[PDB]
Amino acid sequence: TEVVMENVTAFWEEGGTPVLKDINFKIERGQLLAVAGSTGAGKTSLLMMIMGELEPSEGKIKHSGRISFCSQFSWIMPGTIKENIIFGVSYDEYRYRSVIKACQLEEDISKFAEKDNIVLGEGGITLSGGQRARISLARAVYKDADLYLLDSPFGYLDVLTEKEIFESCVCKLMANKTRILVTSKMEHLKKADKILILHEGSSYFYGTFSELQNLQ
Ligand SMILES: O=c1ccn([C@H]2C[C@H](O)[C@@H](COP(=O)(O)OP(=O)(O)OP(=O)(O)O)O2)c(=O)[nH]1
Ligand SMILES: [Mg+2]
């Protein structure tokens, strides 16, 4: 097992409403967990618990290894698009090119005369929301880690682009890696090894897409 939550309850504020209530799941090494649910349901908070920024009041948690986290709020720091993606990690041409292809960024980059040395975050180019989201995803996927926490990374993307990048990046490029993906899209739940649907902190559903279809 790579990540376990067992009867986890947690609070951001002592004496408040629990942000997570009796949460249970298990991910084996290399599997994909999809975490779904409405705004405020506790999805980012669950990721924060895995990253150690929120401790459980009840229950047990297991996880080891390096984490790579992709925030639901895309961000850019001053520097080239290549510097933003490798972001202090050692550079390898093949690895970098595999990530930008999987994130459909080779298309965007090929159109600039400076190519991967185009400068971001310094008042020149103003990136679209979709461009910033794919750069942020690429940054998180480039990092070598044992666990990838991808919090709603497909912001500003149309449904076909989202589908293509989910398949090329999350399913193929990252096929060997333990992944938690916060997402609500049907294909992503169908392809995940397990699904956790949160509602107001509680487990609305936990199991597989097939199990949910069998309840209809
Ligand atoms: O530092 C924090 C983060 C969250 N909350 C609260 C706000 C909210 O009532 C609850 C759930 O927030 P979360 O960000 O975990 O929800 P989400 O499922 O990620 O919502 P969204 O889909 O809008 O990202 O946790 C806090 O009090 N403090
Ligand atoms: Mg969130």
Side-chain angles (χ1 to χ4, degrees), residues 80-85 96-97 99-101 103-120 127 131 134-135 138:
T80 66
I81 192 163
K82 174 178 287 177
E83 291 167 343
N84 264 279
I85 286 168
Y96 171 75
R97 291 286 162 210
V99 174
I100 58 168
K101 289 160 188 194
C103 291
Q104 297 191 5
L105 287 163
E106 203 47 281
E107 180 60 17
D108 309 73
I109 290 162
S110 74
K111 307 299 189 25
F112 321 118
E114 298 281 312
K115 293 299 183 281
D116 305 83
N117 296 323
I118 185 80
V119 176
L120 310 182
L127 298 168
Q131 279 169 334
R134 294 182 286 119
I135 292 163

Coordinates of all heavy atoms in Angstrom, one line a residue, residues 80-85 96-97 99-101 103-120 127 131 134-135 138:
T80 N 12.2 31.4 -17.8 CA 11.7 30.8 -19.1 C 10.7 29.7 -18.8 O 10.5 29.2 -17.7 CB 12.9 30.2 -19.9 OG1 13.4 29.1 -19.2 CG2 14.0 31.2 -20.1
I81 N 10.0 29.3 -19.9 CA 9.0 28.2 -19.8 C 9.8 26.9 -19.4 O 9.3 26.2 -18.6 CB 8.2 28.1 -21.0 CG1 7.0 27.1 -20.7 CG2 9.0 27.6 -22.3 CD1 5.8 27.2 -21.8
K82 N 11.0 26.7 -19.9 CA 11.8 25.6 -19.5 C 12.1 25.6 -18.0 O 11.9 24.6 -17.2 CB 13.0 25.4 -20.3 CG 14.0 24.3 -19.8 CD 15.2 24.2 -20.8 CE 14.8 23.6 -22.1 NZ 15.9 23.5 -23.1
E83 N 12.5 26.8 -17.5 CA 12.9 27.0 -16.1 C 11.6 26.8 -15.2 O 11.7 26.2 -14.1 CB 13.5 28.3 -15.8 CG 14.9 28.5 -16.4 CD 15.3 30.0 -16.4 OE1 14.5 30.9 -16.2 OE2 16.6 30.2 -16.6
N84 N 10.5 27.2 -15.7 CA 9.2 27.1 -14.9 C 8.9 25.6 -14.8 O 8.3 25.2 -13.7 CB 8.1 27.8 -15.5 CG 7.9 29.2 -14.9 OD1 7.3 29.3 -13.8 ND2 8.5 30.2 -15.5
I85 N 9.2 24.8 -15.8 CA 8.7 23.4 -15.8 C 9.7 22.5 -15.0 O 9.3 21.7 -14.1 CB 8.5 22.9 -17.2 CG1 7.2 23.5 -17.8 CG2 8.5 21.3 -17.2 CD1 7.0 23.3 -19.3
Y96 N 12.1 16.1 -20.1 CA 11.5 17.4 -20.4 C 10.6 17.3 -21.6 O 9.4 17.7 -21.6 CB 12.5 18.5 -20.5 CG 12.0 19.8 -20.9 CD1 11.2 20.6 -20.0 CD2 12.2 20.3 -22.2 CE1 10.7 21.8 -20.5 CE2 11.7 21.5 -22.6 CZ 11.0 22.3 -21.7 OH 10.5 23.5 -22.2
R97 N 11.2 16.8 -22.7 CA 10.4 16.8 -24.0 C 9.2 15.8 -23.8 O 8.1 16.1 -24.4 CB 11.3 16.3 -25.1 CG 12.3 17.3 -25.5 CD 11.7 18.5 -26.3 NE 12.7 19.6 -26.3 CZ 12.4 20.9 -26.3 NH1 11.1 21.3 -26.4 NH2 13.3 21.8 -26.2
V99 N 7.4 15.3 -21.2 CA 6.4 16.0 -20.4 C 5.7 17.1 -21.2 O 4.5 17.2 -21.2 CB 7.0 16.6 -19.1 CG1 6.0 17.4 -18.4 CG2 7.5 15.4 -18.2
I100 N 6.5 17.9 -21.9 CA 5.8 19.0 -22.7 C 5.0 18.4 -23.8 O 3.9 19.0 -24.1 CB 6.8 20.1 -23.2 CG1 7.9 19.5 -24.1 CG2 7.4 20.9 -22.0 CD1 8.6 20.6 -24.8
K101 N 5.4 17.3 -24.4 CA 4.5 16.6 -25.4 C 3.3 16.1 -24.8 O 2.2 16.3 -25.3 CB 5.3 15.5 -26.1 CG 6.4 16.0 -27.1 CD 7.4 15.0 -27.4 CE 8.6 15.6 -28.2 NZ 9.5 14.6 -28.9
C103 N 1.7 17.2 -22.2 CA 0.9 18.3 -21.8 C 0.6 19.3 -23.0 O 0.0 20.3 -22.7 CB 1.7 19.1 -20.7 SG 1.8 18.1 -19.2
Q104 N 0.8 18.8 -24.2 CA 0.4 19.6 -25.4 C 1.1 21.0 -25.5 O 0.7 21.9 -26.2 CB -1.1 19.8 -25.6 CG -1.7 18.4 -25.7 CD -3.2 18.5 -26.2 OE1 -3.7 19.6 -26.4 NE2 -3.9 17.4 -26.2
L105 N 2.2 21.2 -24.8 CA 3.0 22.4 -24.8 C 4.0 22.6 -25.9 O 4.4 23.7 -26.2 CB 3.7 22.6 -23.4 CG 2.8 22.9 -22.3 CD1 3.4 22.7 -20.9 CD2 2.3 24.4 -22.4
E106 N 4.3 21.5 -26.6 CA 5.2 21.6 -27.7 C 4.6 22.5 -28.8 O 5.3 23.3 -29.4 CB 5.6 20.2 -28.3 CG 6.9 20.1 -29.1 CD 8.1 20.8 -28.4 OE1 8.2 22.0 -28.5 OE2 8.9 20.0 -27.9
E107 N 3.3 22.3 -29.0 CA 2.5 23.2 -29.9 C 2.7 24.6 -29.6 O 3.1 25.4 -30.4 CB 1.0 22.8 -29.8 CG 0.1 23.7 -30.7 CD 0.5 23.5 -32.1 OE1 1.2 22.6 -32.5 OE2 0.1 24.4 -32.9
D108 N 2.4 25.0 -28.3 CA 2.5 26.4 -27.9 C 4.0 26.9 -28.1 O 4.2 28.0 -28.6 CB 2.1 26.7 -26.5 CG 0.7 26.1 -26.2 OD1 0.6 24.8 -26.1 OD2 -0.2 26.9 -26.1
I109 N 4.9 26.1 -27.6 CA 6.3 26.5 -27.6 C 6.9 26.7 -29.0 O 7.6 27.6 -29.3 CB 7.2 25.5 -26.8 CG1 6.8 25.6 -25.3 CG2 8.6 25.8 -27.0 CD1 7.2 24.5 -24.5
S110 N 6.5 25.8 -29.9 CA 7.0 25.9 -31.3 C 6.7 27.2 -32.0 O 7.3 27.5 -33.0 CB 6.4 24.7 -32.1 OG 5.1 25.0 -32.4
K111 N 5.7 27.9 -31.5 CA 5.2 29.2 -32.2 C 6.0 30.4 -31.7 O 6.0 31.4 -32.4 CB 3.7 29.4 -31.9 CG 2.9 28.2 -32.3 CD 3.0 27.8 -33.8 CE 2.0 26.8 -34.2 NZ 0.8 26.7 -33.3
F112 N 6.8 30.3 -30.7 CA 7.7 31.4 -30.2 C 9.0 31.3 -30.9 O 9.6 30.2 -30.9 CB 7.8 31.5 -28.7 CG 6.6 31.2 -27.9 CD1 6.6 30.1 -27.1 CD2 5.5 32.0 -28.0 CE1 5.5 29.8 -26.3 CE2 4.3 31.7 -27.2 CZ 4.3 30.6 -26.4
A113 N 9.6 32.5 -31.3 CA 10.9 32.5 -31.9 C 12.0 32.0 -30.8 O 13.0 31.4 -31.2 CB 11.3 33.8 -32.4
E114 N 11.7 32.3 -29.6 CA 12.7 31.9 -28.5 C 12.4 30.5 -28.0 O 13.2 30.0 -27.2 CB 12.6 32.9 -27.3 CG 13.0 34.3 -27.6 CD 14.5 34.5 -27.7 OE1 15.2 34.0 -26.8 OE2 15.0 35.1 -28.7
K115 N 11.3 29.8 -28.5 CA 11.1 28.4 -28.2 C 11.0 28.2 -26.7 O 10.4 29.1 -26.0 CB 12.1 27.6 -28.9 CG 12.1 27.6 -30.5 CD 10.7 27.1 -31.0 CE 10.7 27.0 -32.5 NZ 10.4 28.4 -33.0
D116 N 11.7 27.3 -26.1 CA 11.7 27.0 -24.7 C 12.3 28.1 -23.8 O 12.1 28.0 -22.6 CB 12.4 25.6 -24.4 CG 11.8 24.5 -25.2 OD1 12.2 24.4 -26.4 OD2 10.9 23.8 -24.7
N117 N 13.0 29.0 -24.4 CA 13.6 30.1 -23.7 C 12.7 31.4 -23.7 O 13.1 32.4 -23.2 CB 14.9 30.5 -24.3 CG 15.9 29.4 -24.2 OD1 15.9 28.7 -23.1 ND2 16.8 29.2 -25.2
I118 N 11.4 31.3 -24.1 CA 10.5 32.4 -24.0 C 10.3 32.7 -22.5 O 10.3 31.8 -21.6 CB 9.1 32.0 -24.6 CG1 8.2 33.2 -24.5 CG2 8.4 30.8 -23.9 CD1 8.4 34.3 -25.5
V119 N 10.3 34.0 -22.1 CA 10.4 34.4 -20.7 C 9.0 34.7 -20.2 O 8.2 35.4 -20.9 CB 11.3 35.7 -20.5 CG1 11.2 36.1 -19.1 CG2 12.7 35.3 -20.9
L120 N 8.6 34.0 -19.1 CA 7.3 34.2 -18.5 C 7.4 35.0 -17.3 O 8.5 35.2 -16.7 CB 6.7 32.8 -18.2 CG 6.7 31.7 -19.3 CD1 6.1 30.4 -18.8 CD2 6.1 32.3 -20.5
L127 N 0.2 34.7 -20.5 CA -0.3 33.4 -20.8 C -1.8 33.3 -20.6 O -2.4 34.0 -19.7 CB 0.4 32.3 -20.0 CG 1.9 32.1 -20.1 CD1 2.4 31.2 -18.9 CD2 2.3 31.5 -21.4
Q131 N -3.0 27.8 -20.8 CA -1.5 27.6 -20.9 C -0.9 27.5 -19.5 O 0.0 26.7 -19.3 CB -0.9 28.8 -21.7 CG -1.0 28.7 -23.1 CD -0.7 29.9 -23.8 OE1 -0.8 31.0 -23.2 NE2 -0.2 29.9 -25.1
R134 N -1.5 24.1 -18.0 CA -0.7 23.0 -18.5 C 0.8 23.1 -18.1 O 1.5 22.1 -17.9 CB -0.8 22.9 -20.0 CG -2.3 22.5 -20.4 CD -2.5 22.4 -21.9 NE -2.5 23.7 -22.5 CZ -1.7 24.2 -23.5 NH1 -0.7 23.4 -23.8 NH2 -1.8 25.4 -24.0
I135 N 1.3 24.4 -18.0 CA 2.7 24.6 -17.4 C 2.7 24.1 -16.0 O 3.7 23.4 -15.6 CB 3.1 26.0 -17.6 CG1 3.3 26.4 -19.1 CG2 4.4 26.3 -16.8 CD1 3.3 27.9 -19.4
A138 N 2.7 20.3 -16.0 CA 4.0 19.9 -16.5 C 5.1 20.0 -15.4 O 5.9 19.1 -15.2 CB 4.5 20.7 -17.7

